[PDB]
């Protein structure tokens, strides 16, 4: 799909409380930190003899992911998230559809 | 290679016409339905005789074709090819299905039995009722004894019971003989290619006068 790079939407940033301008990006997950509690527990459980101690997923079925837009208010820098439906192709670059022109 | 008609005699299923959900049927074996002197006028052949069913069953298109050929052949041999008008008043629209099983030795190794046993079309049949006309013939009053014998010869090709009834109507119309006579003495009938158009008291008087002039010529 195509989504414009900016959007005027509501900002619950405790000073705006209204529709302000927002710059949009796509949400990236970020690297999984060590010293998270589940990672420490997993490393402790995997140390020693016993082999693999937790399930590892294999039966993948989805081909897409839900895209998440990160909205950032231009006034007070507060951030919002909103998800969309599943799409195989996604772009933020705005190349608008034009109607009465040739193939 | 064809099953006997006792496997498809009775109206056991819902009507199954050829449509956009069938899309692959065999064509019917009967194709000609009106024969004899089909271009004859209405008052040429006053007498009408019906072969009419007494059963509620299905007649095969093959049986309809065989009975048509038998009655036509007998009447053209005994009375001339243009002394009668025969009309088949049933049409095979019901489609018969077959779940074909293999007749090989050790077939159960590859048969699968009754799983997915929905059939394939193999034939066409016409569903008739009690007192429904199969065959109708119109002729002159000098051919009654040969058209009754023609229908009686044709009745052997049909399952079930059929009756031969001499109708009280004039030809292939729906009025009685004296009613049609007292209608045609006035000019309020006018012939068509085989049938006849009638006058009504409704409609525009200009059209009713350009057609049918002799009745208004009073």
């Amino acid at each position: 799909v195509n989504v414009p790079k900016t959007r005027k939407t509501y900002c619950k940033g405790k000073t705006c409380r209204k529709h302000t301008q927002h710059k949009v990006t796509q949400y990236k997950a970020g690297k999984a930190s060590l010293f998270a509690q589940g990672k420490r527990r997993y490393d402790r459980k995997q140390s020693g003899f016993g082999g693999q101690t937790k399930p590892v997923f294999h039966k993948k079925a989805k081909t897409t992911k839900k895209v998440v837009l990160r909205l950032e208010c231009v006034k007070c820098k507060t951030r919002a998230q909103l998800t969309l439906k599943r799409c195989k192709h996604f772009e933020l670059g705005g190349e608008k559809k034009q109607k009465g022109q040739a193939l | 290679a064809r099953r006997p008609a006792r496997c498809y005699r009775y109206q056991k299923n819902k009507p199954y016409p050829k449509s956009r959900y069938n899309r692959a049927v065999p064509d019917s074996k009967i194709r000609i339905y009106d024969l004899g002197k089909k271009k004859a006028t209405v008052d040429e052949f006053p007498l009408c005789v019906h072969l009419v069913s007494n059963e509620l069953e299905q007649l095969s298109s093959e049986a309809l074709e065989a009975a048509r050929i038998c009655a036509n052949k007998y009447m053209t041999t005994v009375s001339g090819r243009d002394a009668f008008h025969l009309r088949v008043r049933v049409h095979p629209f019901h489609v018969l299905r077959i779940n074909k099983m293999l007749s090989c030795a050790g077939a159960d190794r590859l048969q699968q039995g009754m799983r997915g046993a929905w059939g394939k079309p193999h034939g066409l049949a016409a569903r008739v009722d009690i007192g429904q006309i199969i065959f109708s013939v119109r002729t002159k009053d000098s051919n009654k004894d040969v058209v009754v014998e023609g229908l009686r010869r044709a009745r052997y090709k049909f399952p079930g019971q059929q009756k031969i009834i001499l109708s009280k109507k004039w030809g292939f119309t729906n009025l009685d003989r004296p009613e049609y006579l007292k209608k045609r003495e006035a000019g309020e009938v006018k012939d068509d290619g085989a049938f006849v158009k009638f006058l009504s008291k409704k409609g525009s008087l200009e059209n009713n006068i350009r057609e049918f002039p002799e009745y208004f010529a009073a």
Partner: protein
């Protein structure tokens, strides 16, 4: 996603698969029953698109194999210098990131560019690595 799963029986000839984390294109498929009672096993013989090596395998038919996304794209040459092609996209975009082919395709392309034909280049993308497979000449729009 870059890649999506599929079933072995759902796969068929001239389709792309992932074998040993390589984009591969199948040339041969063969299924043989494991035991009389058991399910058949699929034997797959495929060729890597980039390197040309032959990679084979045998899996259960119900097993799911990984499948890449392969995009073939059409471009016009601008220059061949230092082993790196320079291409020109529709709407005027230009890329120089493609390395020139190293085989007889690269030799024929080099001779064709030296003697001055207008060359139409097909480059394919699969799993983050990029290469050129074939070239033609533009019969019209000279």
């Amino acid at each position: 996603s870059a890649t999506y799963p599929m079933q072995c029986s759902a796969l068929r000839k001239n389709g792309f698969v992932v074998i040993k984390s390589r984009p591969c294109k199948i040339v041969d498929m063969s299924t043989s029953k494991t035991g009389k009672h058991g399910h058949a096993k699929v034997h797959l013989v495929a060729i890597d698109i980039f390197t040309g090596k032959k990679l084979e395998d045998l899996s259960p038919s119900t097993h799911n194999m990984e499948v890449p996304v392969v995009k073939r794209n059409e471009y016009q040459l601008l220059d061949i210098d230092d082993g790196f092609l320079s291409l020109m996209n529709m709407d005027g975009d230009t890329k120089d990131d493609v390395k020139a082919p190293e085989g007889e395709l690269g030799d024929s392309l080099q001779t064709a560019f030296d003697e001055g034909k207008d060359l139409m280049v097909t480059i394919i993308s699969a799993m983050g690595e990029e290469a050129a497979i074939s070239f033609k000449e533009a019969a019209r729009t000279d």
